[PDB]
């Protein structure tokens, strides 16, 4: 995260760490959506251009963390994956279209002050909140600059109009994507950065006061450059696939 | 069922340091 | 720079 601030304790209890067993290293962020399911960007698992193809034994998910490197004894819970599920029409060849994956844990994790699930949007929550101008929050242990934080970082950024999003880049933008960030003018900064991938973009509903995940950190070009925006997977547009695997696969 | 209600914030009726910025934008 | 995690995790 760029131009963010340290998160407070228990501020994003759905925040998860994608961690490589060997070498031991942070891979990506992720979000806890139930006690057995984690949501991430498909590209954190599979990206052929970079020789990236991780399977279930390759990874560990770490929940309830604050500290980027420290093993938070008695706070954080580390699970094993039972299964990875990538969106069948994820496009790693052109534009990361449909960049979403589900991971099923070996066992259900127990909730606590630091570990708690986020809500998936419903059709109207999405209707009223996904509006240019409205702000969401992004969290992650990613780079600070286009360094690495000591603790989870957070940033609030506005949703940008689709046209403005298209006009900022040469990559073809689809309906399964939204972009967010301030306008060069607006003078206020921040963005997600490398290492933030697969974390959540959440919004707090003013109706019921719950936090809903609207996006997944997906891609961008540089971090916090003027006239450039962060791109997130549009979770509500992919909910059918999500609903769907959770009932087939448990 | 209990999704998105944070043990240390919503459940205690405490607000984080920047959630209002969010809310203030939903106009 | 990652502090080592407990082996039962491996
Ligand atoms: C993300 O964090 C990521 O996947 N980082 C690599 C894994 C890693 C883990 C720990 C530390 C460092 C890296 C980024 C998120 C970027 C968000 N940026 C902004 N909001 N400004 N994701 C990412 O880099 C993707 C994955 C494949 N890459 C191709 C090159 C891109 N820069 C642009 C691009 C997107 C689509 C198609 C072609 C090019 C890119 O973002 N990604
Ligand atoms: Na363009
Ligand atoms: Na920018």
Q: Which residue reads 């909140």 in tokens? A: A129
Contact residues on chain C for A21, CB-CB shorter than 8 A = 10
**Structural domains of chain A, with CATH:** 1-12+118-236 (2.40.10.10), 13-117+237-249 (2.40.10.10)
CB A212 within 8 A of CB A202: yes
- Report d(CA A27, CA A156) in Å as an integer: 23
Which 3 state secondary structure label does DSSP give A34? Answer: coil
Q: Which residues of A74-84 are buried (b: 16+ CB within 10 A; e: fewer)?
A: ebbbbbebeeb
Ligand 1 shell residues, CB under 6 Å? A 26-28, 43, 47, 95-96, 142, 171, 191-197, 217, 219-221, 223, 230
Domain count, chain B: 1
Q: Which chains touch C (3 or more CB pairs under 8 A)?
A: A
Q: What angle do CA B12, B14, B19 make, to 5 degrees?
A: 135
Q: How far is CA B4 from the centre of its chain?
A: 9
CB B8 within 8 A of CB A113: yes
Cis bond leading into A51, ω under 30°? no
**Which residue owns the Cα nearest ligand 1 atom 16?**
A219
**Strands A211-219 and A230-234, how do they pair?**
antiparallel
For A26, the token pair is: 């942070």
Q: How far apart are the first and last CA of chain B?
A: 28
Structure method: X-ray
**Strands A200-204 and A211-219, how do they pair?**
antiparallel
Ligand nearest the Cα atom of residue A228: 3
Partner-chain contact A135 B21, CB within 8 Å: yes
Closest CA to A25 of C4, B3, B4, B22: C4
Partner-chain contact A78 C5, CB within 8 Å: yes
Choose which residue among A168, A192, A194 to substitute to test ligand 1 binding: the one with the highest number of ligand atoms within 8 A of its C-beta.
Answer: A194
Which 3 state secondary structure label does DSSP give A225? Answer: coil
- Report d(CA B9, CA B5) in Å as an integer: 8
- Report d(CA A133, CA A45) in Å as an integer: 32
Q: Residue B3: give its domain's CATH number.
A: 4.10.140.10
Other CB atoms closer than 10 Å to residue A144's CB: what's the count? Answer: 16
Can you give the residue range of the structural domain that contains B23?
Answer: 1-27
For A80, the token pair is: 């094993």
CB A211 within 8 A of CB A118: yes
The H-or-E segment that residue A219 falls in is strand A211-219
Q: Which residues of C1-10 are buried (b: 16+ CB within 10 A; e: fewer)?
A: eeeebeeeee
CB A30 within 8 A of CB A181: no
Paired residues of A15 in beta bridges: A31
Which 3 state secondary structure label does DSSP give A82? Answer: strand
The H-or-E segment that residue A29 falls in is strand A24-32
Q: Which residues of A222-233 are buried (b: 16+ CB within 10 A; e: fewer)?
A: ebbbeebbbbbb
- Tally helices (H) and strands (E) across chain B: 1, 0
Q: How far is CA A142 from the centre of its chain?
A: 11
Closest CA to A97 of A195, A173, A192, A204: A173
The distance of A114 to chain C (nearest Cα, Å) reads 19
- Report d(CA A241, CA A239) in Å as an integer: 5
Contact residues on chain A for B23, CB-CB shorter than 8 A = 204, 206
Partner-chain contact A10 B8, CB within 8 Å: yes
**Strands A24-32 and A200-204, how do they pair?**
unpaired
Dihedral pair phi/psi, residue A243, rounded to 5°: -50, -60
Using a threshold of 3 CB pairs under 8 A, tell whether chains B and A touch: yes
Paired residues of A203 in beta bridges: A212
Best mutation target among C3, C7, C8 (most A Cβ atoms within 10 Å) is C3
């Amino acid at each position: 995260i760029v131009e963010g601030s340290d998160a407070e304790i228990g501020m994003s209890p759905w925040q998860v760490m994608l961690f490589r067993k060997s070498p031991q290293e942070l891979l990506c962020g992720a979000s806890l959506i139930s006690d057995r399911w984690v949501l991430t960007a498909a590209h954190c698992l599979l990206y052929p251009p970079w020789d990236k193809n991780f399977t279930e034994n390759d990874l560990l998910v770490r929940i309830g963390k604050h500290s980027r490197t420290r093993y938070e004894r008695n706070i954080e819970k580390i699970s094993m994956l039972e299964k990875i599920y990538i969106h069948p029409r994820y496009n790693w060849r052109e534009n990361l279209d449909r960049d979403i994956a589900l991971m099923k844990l070996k066992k259900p994790v127990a909730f606590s002050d630091y570990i708690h699930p986020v809500c998936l949007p419903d059709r109207e929550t999405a209707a009223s909140l996904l509006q240019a101008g409205y702000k969401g929050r992004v969290t992650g242990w990613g780079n600070l600059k286009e360094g690495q934080p000591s603790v989870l970082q957070v940033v609030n950024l506005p949703i940008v109009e689709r046209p403005v999003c298209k006009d900022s880049t040469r990559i073809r933008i689809t309906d399964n994507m939204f972009c967010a960030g301030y306008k060069p003018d607006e003078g206020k900064r921040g963005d997600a950065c490398e290492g933030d991938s697969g974390g959540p973009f959440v919004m707090k509903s003013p109706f019921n006061n719950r936090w809903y995940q609207m996006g997944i950190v997906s891609w961008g070009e540089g971090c916090d450059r003027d006239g450039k925006y962060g791109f997130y997977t549009h979770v509500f547009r992919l909910k059918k696939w999500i609903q769907k695997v959770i009932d087939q696969f448990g | 069922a209990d999704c998105g209600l944070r043990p240390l914030f919503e459940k205690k009726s405490l607000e984080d340091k920047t959630e209002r910025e969010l809310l203030e934008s939903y106009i | 720079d990652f502090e080592e995690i407990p082996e039962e995790y491996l």
